[PDB]
Amino acid sequence: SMEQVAMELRLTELTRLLRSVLDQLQDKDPARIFAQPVSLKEVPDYLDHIKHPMDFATMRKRLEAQGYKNLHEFEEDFDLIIDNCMKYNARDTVFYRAAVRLRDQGGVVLRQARREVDSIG
Ligand code: NA
């Protein structure tokens, strides 16, 4: 149908907007601490601590498969990256501190993406 196509045109434009948002969030992590999944060979106990691992590359594969239906689902994954890190790592570590900085600097990008998604549908 012509309906399914226009919904596919919208999802595709949402995917284009989330791609740009994702590139902007990732620029706030120049150390690439959150780039890749936490290694299970190097942190074998990780899954005893953290039940839903997340990282930028895993968000990227979901993105290019048009796996995010809305901005909220995308925000949930970003929050997991941050919240996982702040639980596993203690306050006086480079990892925890990197999360806090990504959270505060990401807020601005997420604040405007919410207005743009509403605004253009
Ligand atoms: Na902790």
Author numbering: 22 to 142
Publication text:
In this work, we show that unencumbered views of the changed, non-ground state can be obtained by recasting the problem as a multi-data set, 3D background-correction problem, which allows the relevant signal to be extracted from conventional single-data set density. Our new method—Pan-Dataset Density Analysis (PanDDA)—comprises: the characterization of a set of related crystallographic data sets of the same crystal form; the identification of (binding) events; and the subtraction of ground state density to reveal clear density for events. We demonstrate the power of the method by applying it to the most demanding type of changed-state study, namely crystallographic fragment screening, which attempts to observe in electron density the rare and often low occupancy binding events that occur when a relatively large (200–1,000) library of weak-binding ‘fragment' compounds (150–300 Da, 100 μM–10 mM)1819 are added individually or as cocktails to a series of equivalent crystals. Applied to a series of fragment screens, PanDDA yielded markedly more hits than manual inspection of density, far more quickly and all with high confidence, in both known binding sites and new allosteric sites.
An accurate estimate of the background can be obtained by averaging near-convergence density, in real space and after local alignment, from dozens (>30) of independently measured but approximately identical ground-state crystals. Using an averaged ground-state map for subtraction, as opposed to a single ground-state map, reduces experimental noise in the ground-state estimate and thereby also in the event map. Finally, the averaging generates an estimate of the ground state that can be used directly as density, bypassing the need for any subjective modelling and map interpretation. Conventionally, the analysis is challenging as it involves inspecting a lot of 3D space—the whole unit cell in each data set—for convincing evidence of bound fragments (‘hits'). In contrast, PanDDA directly eliminates the thousands of strong electron density blobs with no statistical significance, objectively identifying only regions that are unique to each data set; the ground-state data sets are provided by the many hit-free crystals. All crystallographic data used for the PanDDA analysis must also be made available so that the analysis may be reproduced. The group deposition feature recently added by the PDB22 makes it realistic to deposit all the many changed- and ground-state structures, as well as event maps (see Data Availability).
